[PDB]
Amino acid sequence: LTLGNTTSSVILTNYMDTQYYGEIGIGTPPQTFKVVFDTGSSNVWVPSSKCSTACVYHKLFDASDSSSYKHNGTELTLRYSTGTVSGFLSQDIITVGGITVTQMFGEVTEMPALPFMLAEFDGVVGMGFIEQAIGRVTPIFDNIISQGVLKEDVFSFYYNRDSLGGQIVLGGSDPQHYEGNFHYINLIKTGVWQIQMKGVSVGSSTLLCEDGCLALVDTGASYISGSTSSIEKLMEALGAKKRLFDYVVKCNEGPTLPDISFHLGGKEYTLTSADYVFQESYSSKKLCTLAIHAMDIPPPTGPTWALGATFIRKFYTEFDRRNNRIGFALAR
Ligand SMILES: c1ccc([C@H]2CCNC[C@@H]2OCc2ccc3ccccc3c2)cc1
Ligand SMILES: *[C@@H]1O[C@H](CO)[C@@H](O)[C@H](O)[C@H]1NC(C)=O
């Protein structure tokens, strides 16, 4: 007998405002993994004991220590703008919070040092739709919905500033982590956590996305990202400069930087300089990083902006599967 009355919370660790990860258990007895809960991907994967560079520094799933394991073996490749992993399919029981689900997942045998050496987590729990799942593997949240345990077919994200690192709620939202009410925006289409964006303002003027654009709400992305063209105009308006990997401003100029507003649904979602500048110094002789970068996301998802951790820290986000919508409320 299953009742639709469960809301399960998962505590997240915040690593340097760029990586938010929690724990999942795989197998019998459970093998624990640190995972990023990512709305921009639809597959579950962890490094495998069968792995070979980055595998030496992470926890590895050993199917031979699990009584609940079911062999599959189908080859799996997950390719993204952030990185590419490869491996094979396996089935086992996955526990997330208090929910236990039989899940088809990827045992990763190919983990490149770039960017996986920089990862403090072991794997990724894809929070996206089946439409974007590689190998048409049923995503974890669809398997949780099938169970009929959830109070609501929603999941929410709280990302704290770098003390609770963050929290994911399965089956609802935590009113202790937001203020006021949620404002909802319907998805353009089911299959992707993406909504229409009406404009991007720098200061009081609509400088970008003037004829509208797309916004992927991506929990696994560290930063806000835009296309090369959009980011070039944004960075020139901020007076930011491209160093080796990131855009920087002179630390003394950081607090004076203009507000950046994203016009979504019938509301402006504003990030002040404090929300997007890693203000590690106030010195005129030091360089301060911006939590914004360019990413040319390929079709079908892109060209699109991606609202990552930079955005989520400011706005508590609810991903609603029953109504195909995303809700935002000011985080606390
Ligand atoms: C495998 C690779 C990349 C991703 C993307 C898919 C779109 N959303 C962002 C995710 O990146 C998560 C991620 C992956 C590697 C990382 C390595 C270092 C730091 C952060 C990292 C974050 C999912 C699975
Ligand atoms: C692996 O699982 C998929 C279901 O997602 C199935 O279609 C496929 O035939 C399985 N392969 C093996 C070898 O069991």
Side-chain angles (χ1 to χ4, degrees):
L1 174 70
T2 312
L3 303 171
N5 204 53
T6 301
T7 74
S8 186
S9 299
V10 180
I11 285 157
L12 311 171
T13 299
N14 171 2
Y15 172 73
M16 286 172 89
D17 282 353
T18 56
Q19 306 173 38
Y20 293 83
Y21 55 88
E23 199 182 278
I24 61 162
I26 313 177
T28 311
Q31 290 176 52
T32 76
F33 297 95
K34 291 167 178 241
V35 290
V36 160
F37 293 91
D38 173 40
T39 56
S41 71
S42 312
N43 289 80
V44 179
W45 71 265
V46 286
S48 177
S49 59
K50 277 97 178 181
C51 190
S52 309
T53 329
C55 291
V56 183
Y57 311 100
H58 298 114
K59 291 304 177 274
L60 311 177
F61 177 72
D62 205 324
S64 75
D65 292 334
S66 180
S67 61
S68 51
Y69 167 77
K70 303 280 173 193
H71 171 270
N72 183 275
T74 306
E75 292 265 58
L76 180 87
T77 302
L78 310 171
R79 191 179 79 178
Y80 294 100
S81 296
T82 303
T84 301
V85 293
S86 185
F88 61 87
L89 290 178
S90 293
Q91 188 195 92
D92 215 328
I93 286 152
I94 306 191
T95 70
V96 198
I99 305 165
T100 301
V101 68
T102 291
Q103 180 69 30
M104 191 71 73
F105 69 95
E107 272 204 66
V108 161
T109 61
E110 283 159 272
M111 268 221 291
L114 245 68
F116 303 98
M117 275 290 283
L118 305 162
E120 300 297 320
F121 56 92
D122 309 306
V124 173
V125 167
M127 293 307 287
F129 299 76
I130 198 156
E131 288 92 332
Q132 294 204 156
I134 289 109
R136 297 175 298 104
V137 180
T138 304
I140 196 164
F141 203 69
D142 290 56
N143 286 326
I144 298 170
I145 290 165
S146 302
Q147 292 193 9
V149 286
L150 296 178
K151 193 174 157 200
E152 299 185 306
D153 292 343
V154 314
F155 59 92
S156 303
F157 279 78
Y158 167 66
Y159 279 175
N160 195 357
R161 291 168 192 96
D162 200 51
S163 63
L164 174 71
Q167 188 192 247
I168 181 175
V169 181
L170 304 177
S173 274
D174 189 352
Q176 284 280 278
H177 291 302
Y178 64 85
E179 60 185 75
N181 318 285
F182 278 109
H183 299 114
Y184 301 98
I185 310 98
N186 283 351
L187 304 180
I188 288 136
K189 58 172 180 293
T190 185
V192 47
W193 291 114
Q194 191 175 48
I195 63 180
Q196 189 68 47
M197 182 149 65
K198 296 172 204 184
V200 182
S201 297
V202 178
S204 50
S205 335
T206 302
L207 247 80
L208 308 151
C209 180
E210 298 188 77
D211 304 308
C213 60
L214 306 184
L216 182 73
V217 189
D218 193 353
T219 59
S222 304
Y223 289 176
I224 279 159
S225 83
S227 70
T228 294
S229 177
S230 294
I231 297 308
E232 190 278 319
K233 291 147 91 188
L234 173 57
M235 294 305 175
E236 184 208 6
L238 296 176
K241 302 293 163 174
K242 184 82 155 47
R243 251 223 316 238
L244 192 56
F245 306 104
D246 39 41
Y247 284 95
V248 291
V249 289
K250 274 151 181 285
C251 290
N252 62 306
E253 284 149 58
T256 84
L257 292 183
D259 285 353
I260 301 169
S261 300
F262 302 88
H263 196 201
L264 305 162
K267 177 175 172 169
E268 289 290 354
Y269 291 90
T270 299
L271 305 202
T272 65
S273 65
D275 302 311
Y276 73 80
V277 183
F278 290 105
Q279 200 74 64
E280 292 185 58
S281 177
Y282 290 89
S283 165
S284 62
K285 307 213 196 178
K286 283 182 158 194
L287 294 171
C288 279
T289 291
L290 303 189
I292 308 164
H293 69 159
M295 285 273 273
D296 294 307
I297 298 167
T301 311
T304 191
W305 283 84
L307 304 183
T310 309
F311 192 86
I312 300 147
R313 269 191 292 277
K314 187 71 181 277
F315 304 101
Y316 187 104
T317 310
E318 180 178 279
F319 301 84
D320 181 348
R321 281 297 305 276
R322 170 145 182 96
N323 299 304
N324 292 113
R325 68 188 187 159
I326 292 160
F328 302 115
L330 186 66
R332 80 170 145 115

